[PDB]
Design a protein around this nucleic acid. Sequence first.
RNA 1: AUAAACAUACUUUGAAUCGGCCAAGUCUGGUAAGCAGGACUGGCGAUGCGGGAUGAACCGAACGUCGAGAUAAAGUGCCAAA
RNA 2: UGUCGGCUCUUCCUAUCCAUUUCAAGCAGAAUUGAAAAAAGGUAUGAUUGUUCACCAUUUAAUAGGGAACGUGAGCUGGGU
RNA 3: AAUGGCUGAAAGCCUCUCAAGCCAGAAUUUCGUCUAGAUGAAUACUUUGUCUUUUUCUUGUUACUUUAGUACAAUUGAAAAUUAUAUACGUUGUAUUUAUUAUCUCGUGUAUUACUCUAUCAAAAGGGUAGUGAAUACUGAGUUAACAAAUUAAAGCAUAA
Lengths: 251, 106, 173, 204, 132, 193
Amino acid sequence: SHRKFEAPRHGSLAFHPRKRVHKVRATVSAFPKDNAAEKPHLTGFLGFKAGMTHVIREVKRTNTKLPKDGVLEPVTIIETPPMVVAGFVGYKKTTTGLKPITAVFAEHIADEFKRRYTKKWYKNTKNQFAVHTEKYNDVKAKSKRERQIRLIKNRCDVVRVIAHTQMALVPLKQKKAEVMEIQINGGSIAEKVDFAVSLLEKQISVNSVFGTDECIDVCSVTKGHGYNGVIKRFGVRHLPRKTHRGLRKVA
Amino acid sequence: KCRLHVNAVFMGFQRAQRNQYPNVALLQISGVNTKEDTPFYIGKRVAYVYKVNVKKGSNKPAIRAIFGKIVAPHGNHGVVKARFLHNLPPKAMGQNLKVFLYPSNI
Amino acid sequence: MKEYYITARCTDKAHNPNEIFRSRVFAPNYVVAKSKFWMMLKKQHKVKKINAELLQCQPIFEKNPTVVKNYQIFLRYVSAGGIHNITKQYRDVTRVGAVRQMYNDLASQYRTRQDKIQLISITTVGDKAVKNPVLHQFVGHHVKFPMVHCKPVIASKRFNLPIKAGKLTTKLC
Amino acid sequence: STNNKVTVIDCHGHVLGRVASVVAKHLLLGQKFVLVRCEDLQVCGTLKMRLVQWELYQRKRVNTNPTRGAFHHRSPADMVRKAVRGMLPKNNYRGKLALKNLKCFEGCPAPYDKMKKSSIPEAAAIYSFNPTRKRTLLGELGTAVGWKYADVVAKNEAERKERAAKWYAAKQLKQKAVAEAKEKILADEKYKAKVAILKKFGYA
Amino acid sequence: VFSRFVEVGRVVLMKTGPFASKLAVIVEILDHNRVLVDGPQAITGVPRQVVNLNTISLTSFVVNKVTRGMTHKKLCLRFTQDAIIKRFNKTATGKAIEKRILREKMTDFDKFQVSIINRKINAAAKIAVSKK
Amino acid sequence: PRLLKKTEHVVIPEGVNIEINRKNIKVTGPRGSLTREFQHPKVDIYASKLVVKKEGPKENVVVIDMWYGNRRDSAVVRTIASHIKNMITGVTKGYQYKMRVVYAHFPVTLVIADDGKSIQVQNFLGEKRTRHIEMYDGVVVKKLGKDEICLEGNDVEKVSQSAANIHAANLVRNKDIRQFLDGVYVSEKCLIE
RNA sequence: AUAAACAUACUUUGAAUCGGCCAAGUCUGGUAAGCAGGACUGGCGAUGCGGGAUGAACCGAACGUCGAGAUAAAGUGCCAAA
RNA sequence: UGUCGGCUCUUCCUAUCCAUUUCAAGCAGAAUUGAAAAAAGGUAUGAUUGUUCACCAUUUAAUAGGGAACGUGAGCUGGGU
RNA sequence: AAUGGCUGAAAGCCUCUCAAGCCAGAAUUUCGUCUAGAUGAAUACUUUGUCUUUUUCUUGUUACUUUAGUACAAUUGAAAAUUAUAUACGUUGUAUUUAUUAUCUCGUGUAUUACUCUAUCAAAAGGGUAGUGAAUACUGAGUUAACAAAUUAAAGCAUAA
């Protein structure tokens, strides 16, 4: 028999399975489409949600009935100290998807970046990138670095820099940095690698990535809530008071 | 040193849709594409030579073989019937068999 | 298909024992030809096997099976609607071959099995008496056509390999 | 003996199901197969006809859990693997081992582009098809149903042709010079004893 | 434009049957699938018979003044006038057929000599081509 | 029924050259060059000298022959011949499709870009929307007179389709089209020369 | 005419069973039914085997344990022998 | 094999009520009527009655028709039987 | 998609095509974007450099420890496209497994190689350059053969990450 009355289904099937992530940081699934007729630039950053407040803003849109004295709106503050570029990676378009070809790293790597490679820092030998730094200027290692640059300029289509935050600039108790790959969108692969090479060990501020009054996309992990019933997870209707064995379940 | 055999593939046992008779094995000799080229191989020797990884303390040979004869053709496509001293193991389906040039009639 | 010349006569009070019935029956073998012959006598002259006796049943061979002739076949076939008389034309060197063509043609074009067709007659027509729209184009003295998209011909089943080397090609032939 | 070599089938100008039937039989005969360019295979019917057939295939899906249901791979190499798997024994070790010897790739990858290629005369489209019967390439059908790597294969194939165009041009020059040097040896006065044997058996 | 046609007088080569690799002449076209070939029985040995077109191959020779239903007496006369046998033996197909007849009467010893000689000649011809 | 040989030909005039490479005909004339691929697997296109008049001399023709083939597949011999005939005419005396604007109350203003490769349709039936139909390569729009435009080109298929694009952009919706006779219609089709 | 001596004729004593169902170049009641009820025969029940992918009844053919051969129904692109 | 309805909830069919794209009219406009593509999204609140049904009062772009053991009782309720 | 059209035959005209070839057109489909996610890839450090199994230490992994056995650089596999394919030829008529004249020694140089190795320039190349060896041709000669014989197992825990 048909359901007597029609109603929209509770919850979205676009978000099933409904499973909690493991890492706190959320990797962006995609980057803006590349355009080859513009100067190279970075297409992303990384910040920490400080909190919310509210503002009053003057309305500049015309033909609107909003008050001329301003409208109260909520805002979210995202603290974004400058990030440090530690290296870059080239990607190649294969018949199975993007494949990283090689990764080139800077000479000096901060201890915040190194902590990402262990699970117990205080019990570690803390020798991450030690061989890479020790023989950085060796003639054999210099030629390998140049070949890596040349290989990317020939057999790569996507260039991303490896940038990490400086956790000493935020009140977070964490000391291990958060690492993100920021894709370079711009000219050819030759001038994209040149842009990334000049960015090694430099600091990139959030103003160099985002402009003024720019609409952007934000990717993050929602606040955890633990085990929950069907009333909160989906929003189904509660059962009558007369119900045996409980009210907050799908009948 | 030299090649004095022809690779024949152990296609399977003489069978029907749902039954199977392991007394006769069906071989597909290399280079024989029709039943009219089969009369040469009727009566020839066929060996299924297989390797067994024996232990050092064992006197069993590392290389063993099962010998048989080609007795009749099977269809119009050069497949033959062979009978062996012991029925071939069905784990050897698709493996290669040696078809020798003896008993010679030339 | 084969030809047979069959003669017989009836010896009973209804048929005089001087009337001889002849036919030229097409059949795969002489047993089938006799059966076709006896159905005609029963269905036309009330002559039955028990009351009659066969005289001759001998094969008929083409005098010159090397000259191409235009055969005109008159036949009747039973369909769902009823019974129709049809005239078909075939080109061949033997009478039996043309009749074999007719049976295969009727079974495909009209979906009519063998046991629904009766071959009334088969004669030889002239060059310009061919009316088949397709067959008429090969009757002239200057028929010429290039056979294209040829598949290469294998000499025998010996050289018929399942997987070959290199690329495959057709032939302008 | 043992067959350690790989039979490389160029799936260009072939029919999907007729290639699969021959390969699936030989996979059961112990042969190792690689079907390069499994996206250039042809199937009967226009694109509109093929897309309708795909929609019927895409409908088959477990109602209570689509993740358990039939998985409809769009890659042409996976289209062929589905066809070949259907012609092999099901749920036994014999059919699993046979399918372990088969590979398609959408182009010609690094090891298989310099190997000897084979053809299946039974599966050639020029033999089994009326020329006016409209066909569809597996690649063209794959793009229409959501195969994202159609232009990656085209780019990789374009590089492969231009590299083979100069390898063949260079090799032709060597073979022409070798053939001439062979003609001077064959016509040489001192080689008469050897050449006489060659001509007597039709080799010269 | 097509160069070889199925017509009366066209010399065809039988590919299968008891008369494979024997020359023949088309004398009458039955229909699109069948022709009558009478490659002179007194010369090539192929009797006047009806053959499907799938079992022959056209050659580049057409006998002049060959008409429909040409008799074997006159066909033999015109067959030897154009010297079809002489001309066919100089073609790639003519030499391919002759080679196969030569090879099929080679014993083991004869194949041994050719492999030894051909290997040396081919290797020697490779040495004679400089690499600069 | 099947035809043993269905044949057609087109006559190459004095100042026209044609090269055929696997059913890829490239006709060159005084007014430019034209190329088209005829991907039918059963036609044979080649150039030859044939007598087309009952008593005239040989003149160069392009012969399109199709041998044994049913009536469904034999219909492309004349189709290909007519396409080649149109391509010959388009490079000697190019095609021209003249169009006229019909309106009852609201005048329609046509804005043609300087290059002529696009047109603008404004105030069609008083609508605020503006149509900016573009044209195919080799098709040029110019305004002849009041409420009249024409398209010039060497390819009839592109000139006619561009004309169809202009008309199809000005269709009356949700109204009686027998009463609202508004739009841009092809008055007549002719040759430039 | 043909067949029939481990033929033929039986005698005594006794078991189980008398819910049946199916097919169809058959029939009746019914609009009809995988419905109800019949005439003749063959079946299933009581029966496995080869085939029809699967199936009480269809087709071939009825069964001690086996070897080698010709076969029946029906098949011969792969699964699957051809 | 827990025997009606309602509450709850998911999914499916199209013989489509609305929204999207089209054609026809005895289509001037507006409002409508017949039909094609299309089942991805929607299809309500109440008085009386256990009611399915029914009939009224509204609101809506529309308040379409049905299936899933006449969906759904170790899911409820127990008004009907 | 329905539909409306262009060019255009069949069928000298006509025709949106129960023909070839195209265009416009949906809350449509596919990419793009969102969520989950398989085999994977890159880099950092620890190693290892012909190979495994059985024991054994550790929360566990890897390296590691011991007794053996085993192999030893050198000819390995590519036209593309079309198929009514410019002309000509039809080059016929056996894909893989499976194309080396037994072994060793003696004799001099040249030449060749999708051959091996080293150095260098390069490089997600069957790459270039130089050198070296191997195989082969020019192109030899000699010795010998008779019976025989011609793939991993089993045990440990010192140190290090």
